[PDB]
Amino acid sequence: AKEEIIWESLSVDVGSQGNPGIVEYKGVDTKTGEVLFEREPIPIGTNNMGEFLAIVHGLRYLKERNSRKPIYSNSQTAIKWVKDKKAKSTLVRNEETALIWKLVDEAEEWLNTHTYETPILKWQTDKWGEIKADYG
Amino acid sequence: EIIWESLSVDVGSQGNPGIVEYKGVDTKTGEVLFEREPIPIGTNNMGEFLAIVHGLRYLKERNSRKPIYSNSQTAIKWVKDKKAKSTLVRNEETALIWKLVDEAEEWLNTHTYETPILKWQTDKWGEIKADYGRK
RNA sequence: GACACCUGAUUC
DNA sequence: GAATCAGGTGTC
Ligand SMILES: [Mg+2]
Ligand SMILES: [Mg+2]
Ligand SMILES: [Mg+2]
Ligand SMILES: [Mg+2]
Numbered sequence: 701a702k703e704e705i706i707w708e709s710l711s712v713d714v715g716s717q718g719n720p721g722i723v724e725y726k727g728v729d730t731k732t733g734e735v736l737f738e739r740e741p742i743p744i745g746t747n748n749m750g751e752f753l754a755i756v757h758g759l760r761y762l763k764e765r766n767s768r769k770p771i772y773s774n775s776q777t778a779i780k781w782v783k784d785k786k787a788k789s790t791l792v793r794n795e796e797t798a799l800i801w802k803l804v805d806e807a808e809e810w811l812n813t814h815t816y817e818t819p820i821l822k823w824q825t826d827k828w829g830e831i832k833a834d835y836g
Numbered sequence: 837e838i839i840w841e842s843l844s845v846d847v848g849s850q851g852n853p854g855i856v857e858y859k860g861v862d863t864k865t866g867e868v869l870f871e872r873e874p875i876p877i878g879t880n881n882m883g884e885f886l887a888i889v890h891g892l893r894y895l896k897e898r899n900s901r902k903p904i905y906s907n908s909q910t911a912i913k914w915v916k917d918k919k920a921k922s923t924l925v926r927n928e929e930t931a932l933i934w935k936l937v938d939e940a941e942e943w944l945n946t947h948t949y950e951t952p953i954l955k956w957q958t959d960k961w962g963e964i965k966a967d968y969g970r971k
Numbered sequence: 972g973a974c975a976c977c978u979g980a981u982u983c
Numbered sequence: 984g985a986a987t988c989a990g991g992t993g994t995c
Binding site for chain 2: 978979980981982983
């Protein structure tokens with residue numbers, strides 16, 4: 701197949717220091733690389749929770765702007781979680797991990813109370829190389 | 837913080853896998869205490885492993901209690917486990933490095949030591965003192 | 972096995 | 984920027 705990148709899109713990726721560890725995420729214009737949104741470093745979180753938050757944040761960003769652009773993520777886990785509207789994270793829940801869980805609860809609440817037209821697509825890393833929203 | 841009364845070791849190579857050498861130095865002085873003759877074919881991690889054990893033997897025979905610094909997370913673990921886990925092909929071309937690694941492992945399995953093996957915090961203190969010059 | 976995210980090094 | 988040597992966790 702000649703499946704090609706849809707450039708008119710939003711790509712999200714997570715960046716961390718450790719896992720679990722410090723987690724950040726951002727959404728960029730797939731074509732230009734321009735950062736559209738970002739999250740301040742969360743002291744303790746996992747890669748999957750971060751990828752999940754990033755996609756939902758993207759859904760909210762595009763909906764508010766009445767955009768029909770699809771969202772790309774290379775995380776099969778986060779994509780499934782958003783589809784299920786449930787983040788199945790094993791991260792222990794306590795004072796240290798209270799913030800990331802608070803954000804995850806907020807994202808689930810959002811997914812369960814809003815509809816969206818956005819196609820959530822799996823970034824074909826093997827076919828296209830690293831996703832554009834990567835940190836470096 | 838940094839413990840200056842210590843021995844620092846590091847590997848150096850040209851290619852990886854490639855030619856490898858290693859050395860130990862007085863962390864404070866910078867004085868070279870030992871330096872291995874270049875080995876034709878080896879890996880960076882095999883070299884870091886040899887360097888630490890060599891340092892261990894060096895301190896052991898002097899009944900020194902000073903610690904050893906290495907910036908190698910891999911080699912520090914191999915030493916704690918008393919087992920190197922290199923993926924390097926084992927044959928006539930790599931016989932020397934493997935002979936040294938086998939002997940270093942055997943040394944660990946035939947001696948006791950008190951020497952604390954510490955991780956050099958490159959992120960905070962800069963490059964290890966036994967570092968090899970660029971190029 | 973798969974999709975990810977890292978950690979510490981060695982070099983060219 | 985490219986390549987290789989090693990150890991580790993989150994999830995499906
Ligand atoms: Mg990702
Ligand atoms: Mg990435
Ligand atoms: Mg080193
Ligand atoms: Mg060095």
